[PDB]
Scaffold this motif. Structure first.
Motif, PDB file in Angstrom:
ATOM      1  N   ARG A 115      25.291  27.253  10.007  1.00 26.73           N
ATOM      2  CA  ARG A 115      24.587  25.987   9.876  1.00 26.73           C
ATOM      3  C   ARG A 115      24.236  25.428  11.253  1.00 26.73           C
ATOM      4  N   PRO A 116      23.290  26.074  11.949  1.00 25.05           N
ATOM      5  CA  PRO A 116      22.883  25.615  13.280  1.00 25.05           C
ATOM      6  C   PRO A 116      22.246  24.227  13.238  1.00 25.05           C
ATOM      7  N   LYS A 117      22.398  23.488  14.328  1.00 28.64           N
ATOM      8  CA  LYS A 117      21.836  22.154  14.420  1.00 28.64           C
ATOM      9  C   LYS A 117      20.333  22.255  14.624  1.00 28.64           C
ATOM     10  N   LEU A 118      19.632  21.191  14.257  1.00 26.48           N
ATOM     11  CA  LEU A 118      18.191  21.126  14.427  1.00 26.48           C
ATOM     12  C   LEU A 118      17.931  21.022  15.922  1.00 26.48           C
ATOM     13  N   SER A 119      17.006  21.827  16.433  1.00 29.21           N
ATOM     14  CA  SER A 119      16.678  21.774  17.851  1.00 29.21           C
ATOM     15  C   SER A 119      15.899  20.486  18.107  1.00 29.21           C
ATOM     16  N   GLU A 120      15.694  20.142  19.375  1.00 30.67           N
ATOM     17  CA  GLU A 120      14.943  18.936  19.692  1.00 30.67           C
ATOM     18  C   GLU A 120      13.519  19.063  19.162  1.00 30.67           C
ATOM     19  N   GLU A 121      12.952  20.263  19.255  1.00 33.52           N
ATOM     20  CA  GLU A 121      11.599  20.490  18.766  1.00 33.52           C
ATOM     21  C   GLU A 121      11.527  20.303  17.253  1.00 33.52           C
ATOM     22  N   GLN A 122      12.541  20.792  16.546  1.00 29.61           N
ATOM     23  CA  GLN A 122      12.577  20.665  15.094  1.00 29.61           C
ATOM     24  C   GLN A 122      12.727  19.206  14.674  1.00 29.61           C
ATOM     25  N   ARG A 141      11.575  16.709  16.379  1.00 33.44           N
ATOM     26  CA  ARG A 141      10.266  16.119  16.644  1.00 33.44           C
ATOM     27  C   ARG A 141       9.288  16.450  15.522  1.00 33.44           C
ATOM     28  N   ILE A 142       9.288  17.705  15.083  1.00 34.39           N
ATOM     29  CA  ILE A 142       8.398  18.129  14.007  1.00 34.39           C
ATOM     30  C   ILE A 142       8.638  17.272  12.763  1.00 34.39           C
ATOM     31  N   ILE A 143       9.904  17.101  12.406  1.00 29.18           N
ATOM     32  CA  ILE A 143      10.267  16.303  11.243  1.00 29.18           C
ATOM     33  C   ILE A 143       9.860  14.837  11.422  1.00 29.18           C
ATOM     34  N   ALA A 144      10.130  14.278  12.597  1.00 25.54           N
ATOM     35  CA  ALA A 144       9.782  12.888  12.859  1.00 25.54           C
ATOM     36  C   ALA A 144       8.271  12.713  12.748  1.00 25.54           C
ATOM     37  N   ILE A 145       7.529  13.666  13.302  1.00 26.60           N
ATOM     38  CA  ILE A 145       6.074  13.628  13.269  1.00 26.60           C
ATOM     39  C   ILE A 145       5.546  13.703  11.840  1.00 26.60           C
ATOM     40  N   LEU A 146       6.105  14.605  11.037  1.00 22.86           N
ATOM     41  CA  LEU A 146       5.658  14.751   9.655  1.00 22.86           C
ATOM     42  C   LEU A 146       5.996  13.522   8.804  1.00 22.86           C
ATOM     43  N   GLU A 181      12.971  13.016   1.765  1.00 24.57           N
ATOM     44  CA  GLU A 181      11.581  12.884   2.181  1.00 24.57           C
ATOM     45  C   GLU A 181      11.264  13.949   3.227  1.00 24.57           C
ATOM     46  N   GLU A 182      12.261  14.294   4.040  1.00 19.01           N
ATOM     47  CA  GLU A 182      12.089  15.322   5.066  1.00 19.01           C
ATOM     48  C   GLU A 182      11.666  16.658   4.443  1.00 19.01           C
ATOM     49  N   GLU A 183      12.335  17.042   3.362  1.00 19.08           N
ATOM     50  CA  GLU A 183      12.026  18.294   2.681  1.00 19.08           C
ATOM     51  C   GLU A 183      10.650  18.206   2.023  1.00 19.08           C
ATOM     52  N   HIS A 184      10.346  17.029   1.484  1.00 16.19           N
ATOM     53  CA  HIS A 184       9.074  16.775   0.818  1.00 16.19           C
ATOM     54  C   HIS A 184       7.876  16.987   1.745  1.00 16.19           C
ATOM     55  N   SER A 223       8.723  26.527   8.323  1.00 11.25           N
ATOM     56  CA  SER A 223       9.684  27.084   7.367  1.00 11.25           C
ATOM     57  C   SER A 223      11.089  27.169   7.963  1.00 11.25           C
ATOM     58  N   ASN A 224      11.170  27.562   9.230  1.00 13.37           N
ATOM     59  CA  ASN A 224      12.459  27.665   9.901  1.00 13.37           C
ATOM     60  C   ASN A 224      13.063  26.274  10.039  1.00 13.37           C
ATOM     61  N   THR A 225      12.205  25.281  10.261  1.00 13.62           N
ATOM     62  CA  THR A 225      12.655  23.901  10.390  1.00 13.62           C
ATOM     63  C   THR A 225      13.231  23.445   9.051  1.00 13.62           C
ATOM     64  N   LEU A 226      12.527  23.764   7.969  1.00 11.55           N
ATOM     65  CA  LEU A 226      12.970  23.383   6.632  1.00 11.55           C
ATOM     66  C   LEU A 226      14.291  24.066   6.276  1.00 11.55           C
ATOM     67  N   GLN A 227      14.371  25.369   6.519  1.00 12.38           N
ATOM     68  CA  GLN A 227      15.592  26.117   6.229  1.00 12.38           C
ATOM     69  C   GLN A 227      16.785  25.548   6.993  1.00 12.38           C
ATOM     70  N   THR A 228      16.547  25.165   8.243  1.00 14.03           N
ATOM     71  CA  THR A 228      17.597  24.606   9.089  1.00 14.03           C
ATOM     72  C   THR A 228      18.014  23.226   8.606  1.00 14.03           C
ATOM     73  N   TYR A 229      17.032  22.400   8.260  1.00 11.69           N
ATOM     74  CA  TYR A 229      17.325  21.060   7.779  1.00 11.69           C
ATOM     75  C   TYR A 229      18.165  21.145   6.512  1.00 11.69           C
ATOM     76  N   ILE A 230      17.741  21.989   5.579  1.00 11.23           N
ATOM     77  CA  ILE A 230      18.462  22.148   4.320  1.00 11.23           C
ATOM     78  C   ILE A 230      19.911  22.582   4.547  1.00 11.23           C
TER      79      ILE A 230
END
Ligand SMILES: C=C1/C(=C\C=C2/CCC[C@]3(C)[C@@H]([C@H](C)CCCC(C)(C)O)CC[C@@H]23)C[C@@H](O)[C@H](OCCC)[C@@H]1O
Length: 253
Positions: free
Chosen positions: A3-10, A12-17, A158-161, A191-198
């Motif tokens: 269960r790796p942590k979300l990277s800073e880029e990931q 940002r991607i989530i915050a942006i979306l 909402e993040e997954e949505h 997809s990698n961001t979503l898998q990691t978030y989940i």
């Protein structure tokens, strides 16, 4: 397992979306009074002949969908990496995913209380009957309702949505795409961001959830096909173009 942590880029991607969605989806449905008014003709028998002769709900629903397509275009332009694609590929992705994203985003107004899309008041509540009054049949509506319930039961954050909608839009397997490799790279990042978030938000069913979300994307392709088939029939009805909009005509034409 891992269960790796979300990277800073990931992050940002989530915050942006999330921000993109908040700016393109009004949860108060305050713009609905600007659409052509809904009209419900007496059609308890679901008469195809009557529905086609009237298409009473089409102007309103066409405006709603047209409005939604404009919001989706805006959302898509904010997806990290989307701007890196050629204008040509952007348009291809948007036209091919438009109806699917609309079906996905509509889950926010969908309610299992009475299996309808409720947008504020009763005038803006849509049920199976209202959609048939727009010229569509149960062959599309019933599976769509089933899809909405299944999506609802996933209880997505909402993040997954928003990540799901982004992934839907940035799909390399859309006919006509030129740089499938670049599109796949962008989708993989999402997809990698979503898998990691989940995984760090859901204990291992994280694996079951991701699989279920991906299955929804497959379901959407089928709904997309049926809608296209039905839109074609609808287009045959004389004077139908005036009940639609220029954007709708081009996207589904
Ligand atoms: C649009 C949206 C909504 C509901 C979606 C519905 C309810 C009525 C019938 C539709 C529109 C289906 C039919 C099958 C498409 C018909 C299209 C045609 C006529 C061209 O063939 C597809 C999705 C169905 C309302 C709200 O959540 C969003 O609204 C935006 C408010 C924030 C979203 O964006």
């Amino acid at each position: 397992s891992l269960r790796p942590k979300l990277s800073e880029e990931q992050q940002r991607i989530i915050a942006i979306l999330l921000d993109a969605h908040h700016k393109t989806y009004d949860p108060t449905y305050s713009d609905f009074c600007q659409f052509r008014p809904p009209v419900r003709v007496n059609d308890g028998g679901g008469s195809v002949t009557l529905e086609l002769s009237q298409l009473s709900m089409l102007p309103h629903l066409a405006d709603l969908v047209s409005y939604s397509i404009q919001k989706v275009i805006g959302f898509a332009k904010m997806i990290p990496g989307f701007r890196d694609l050629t204008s040509e590929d952007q348009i291809v992705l948007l036209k091919s995913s438009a109806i699917e994203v609309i079906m996905l985003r509509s889950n926010e107004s969908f309610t299992m209380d009475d299996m309808s899309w409720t947008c504020g008041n009763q005038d803006y509540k849509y049920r199976v009957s209202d959609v048939t009054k727009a010229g569509h049949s149960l062959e599309l509506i019933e599976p769509l309702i089933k899809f909405q319930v299944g999506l609802k039961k996933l209880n997505l954050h909402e993040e997954e949505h928003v990540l799901l909608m982004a992934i839907c839009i940035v799909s390399p397997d859309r006919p006509g795409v030129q740089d499938a490799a670049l599109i796949e790279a962008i989708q993989d990042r999402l997809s990698n961001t979503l898998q990691t978030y989940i995984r760090c938000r859901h204990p291992p069913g994280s694996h079951l959830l991701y699989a279920k979300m991906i299955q929804k994307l497959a379901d959407l392709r089928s709904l997309n096909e049926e809608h296209s088939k039905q839109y074609r029939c609808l287009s045959f009805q004389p004077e139908c173009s005036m009940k639609l909009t220029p954007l709708v005509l081009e996207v589904f034409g």
